Amino acid sequence: NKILLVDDDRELTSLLKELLEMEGFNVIVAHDGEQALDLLDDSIDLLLLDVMMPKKNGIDTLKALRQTHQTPVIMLTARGSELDRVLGLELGADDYLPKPFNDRELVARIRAILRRSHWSEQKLAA
Amino acid sequence: NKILLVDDDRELTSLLKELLEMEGFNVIVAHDGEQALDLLDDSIDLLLLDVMMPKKNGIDTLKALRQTHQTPVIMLTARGSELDRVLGLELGADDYLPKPFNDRELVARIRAILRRSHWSEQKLAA
Ligand SMILES: [Mg+2]
Numbered sequence: 177n178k179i180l181l182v183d184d185d186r187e188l189t190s191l192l193k194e195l196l197e198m199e200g201f202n203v204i205v206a207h208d209g210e211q212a213l214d215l216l217d218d219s220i221d222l223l224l225l226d227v228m229m230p231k232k233n234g235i236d237t238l239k240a241l242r243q244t245h246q247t248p249v250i251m252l253t254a255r256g257s258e259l260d261r262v263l264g265l266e267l268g269a270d271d272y273l274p275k276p277f278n279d280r281e282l283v284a285r286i287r288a289i290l291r292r293s294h295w296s297e298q299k300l301a302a
Numbered sequence: 303n304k305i306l307l308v309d310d311d312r313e314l315t316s317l318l319k320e321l322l323e324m325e326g327f328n329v330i331v332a333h334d335g336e337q338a339l340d341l342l343d344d345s346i347d348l349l350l351l352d353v354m355m356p357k358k359n360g361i362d363t364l365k366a367l368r369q370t371h372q373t374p375v376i377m378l379t380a381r382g383s384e385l386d387r388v389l390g391l392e393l394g395a396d397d398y399l400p401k402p403f404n405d406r407e408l409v410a411r412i413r414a415i416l417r418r419s420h421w422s423e424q425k426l427a428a
Pocket residue numbers: 183184185226227228229
């Protein structure tokens with residue numbers, strides 16, 4: 177499973193890339209919404225997407241990517257109010273996990289969404 | 303979209319049934335895990351599942367239903383610690399929302415999972 181990490185915090189993306197690679201995932205990193213849209217293709221199984229970023233924020237990135245891709249999206253951001261969470265889900269995200277987050281919960285939420293994607297893929301191939 | 307509500311709190315299930323029917327859903331209620339397994343068939347689009355219940359708890363209900371059904375499951379329970387959340391996701395739930403919860407976030411999470419189910423169904427039919 178290939179994960180596209182989108183966040184301008186280079187300390188967080190380096191830490192998450194190491195954590196997720198140790199959990200068996202292939203991780204690629206984008207540091208803004210424009211770079212995310214450049215790297216998004218059919219090889220991506222899931223996006224971890226921040227909101228506040230320079231060049232193109234995560235809400236605009238989510239709206240743009242949903243015009244061409246149904247790729248699973250988890251918002252992962254310091255914008256964690258109940259209003260922010262509903263906004264992210266309604267604009268096309270599958271899940272929304274505020275920062276600070278628990279590493280184990282993030283890994284379990286990634287695994288839960290990819291388990292459902294795999295079930296859909298098995299049925300489609302059959 | 304047809305929702306199976308599983309919780310022993312009759313005050314909560316009556317309130318949620320009214321809320322969800324006003325949001326356009328068809329809602330059926332089970333008050334324990336045994337009744338949930340009796341009511342679970344291919345017509346159910348999503349389960350809202352509690353943990354602490356008499357006769358059969360939600361963790362055992364989730365394990366049993368995952369042997370025959372890939373139906374989307376959201377755990378909705380007062381067992382809200384980070385450890386409880388990871389446990390629920392790892393045992394087969396798609397999402398996990400602790401009580402007390404925000405009504406709008408619950409509705410958005412239901413809508414997000416059913417939006418993904420609809421995308422899978424469209425592809426499968428094509
Ligand atoms: Mg940021």
